[PDB]
């Protein structure tokens, strides 16, 4: 069965932030408008028996000082008076400012994503669901003691921790426009959680990592890829702007297949940030949600074909209607692949709460008309072999080679 995280309180909290506003409501309501909810298993967000238990859970990754500061940020933003100079300095020291501002619900909002992704992980662990979706989660940039890119708590890292602690190996796949730095860092030293991010990278583009390592020497630059026992276990594919569905699919396809073959993961966690869409305000990549093929749908279908318990998460995407259009198709596709039953989504957006937001055409398709990679493939193939050799993994080097 395919599970999805939702709930009345969950929805309210996920819609309480200034940056993402009511995005989660549009997503879930569009899924509902397409009559998909009865096909899905409702997974309630996790709750804790006490403040201490909650704190224990979140500090499994985050520092106590950082969690304390994030809690204080909420309290301060629920008061009339301005922050003191000392409190400003404190918040700045955790990057709780700039693109990670405070707001009255900042702690509750951030924690909600954690509640949802932990619950999703548990439903996979006890085998209640074969796949679980959490469109309220996917906050890949949050660090141990730093907020980053409107990510305050890293629900992904905490969920993966739960999965690995349930030998267990986890494959993390980050499809967002931006490098999955927080998750990559969290597992930099662990061979058990392999991370793979495909993203745009270019000078001055956030967050700046996931590409060639810039250092003071004249040698050709190279990629960092993990450390200690985690050497070779962090994979990255930076792509130039403008890439379309087909080229993006061909770029990541062989990599995904080779990773599954070599790693043989017990769980897959996929971050499906929707900011690669051609209609995203970034205007960097040109992916679509087309399903006659959308790069996103191509990747998800491939991952699902592995029949490995899978967690599907959200992430970036500041065009709310088109993010909803994409995730609705991802959800329908997941039902179809898992349950082996056909879904017939009307090409026309059905009347519902937010119908008006889908102008002007009101169709399910987004309103859009559509050497380096070979070098990356060779590099990645070499890294995969290196990872396998270091971890004494069994597999056919030629079969994997033939994938590319
Ligand atoms: K990414
Ligand atoms: K790793
Ligand atoms: Zn992003």
Author numbering: 2 to 167, 177 to 302, 316 to 393, 402 to 435
Question: What is the paper's account of this structure, in its own sentences?
Answer:
Crystals were obtained that belonged to space group P1 and which diffracted to 1.8 Å resolution. The final model contains four independent non-crystallographic monomers (r.m.s.d. on Cα's from 0.1 to 0.6 Å), and has good deviations from ideal geometry, with R-factor and R-free values of 0.15 and 0.19. We were able to crystallize smHDAC8 in a non-inhibited form. However, we observed in our electronic density the unambiguous presence of an L-tartrate molecule provided by the crystallization buffer which was bound in the smHDAC8 active site where it coordinated the catalytic zinc ion. Our structural data suggest that HDAC8 enzymes display some flexibility at their active sites, which could explain that small molecules (e.g. L-tartrate in our native form and inhibitors in the other cases) coordinating the catalytic zinc are required to stabilize the protein and support crystallization. First, as expected, we observe the replacement of M274 by H292 in smHDAC8 that diminishes the hydrophobic character of the pocket that normally accommodates the aliphatic part of the incoming acetylated lysine. Further, while the position of smHDAC8 D100 is similar to that of its human counterpart, D101, we observe a change in conformation of the smHDAC8 Y341 side chain compared to hHDAC8 Y306. In contrast, the smHDAC8 Y341 side chain points towards the rim of the catalytic pocket. The most striking and certainly least expected difference concerns the smHDAC8 F151 side chain that is turned away from the catalytic pocket and is inserted into a smaller hydrophobic pocket formed by loops that surround the active site. In the schistosome HDAC8 enzymes, this leucine is replaced by a serine (S18). This smaller residue enlarges the pocket accommodating the F151 side chain, enabling it to adopt its observed flipped-out conformation.
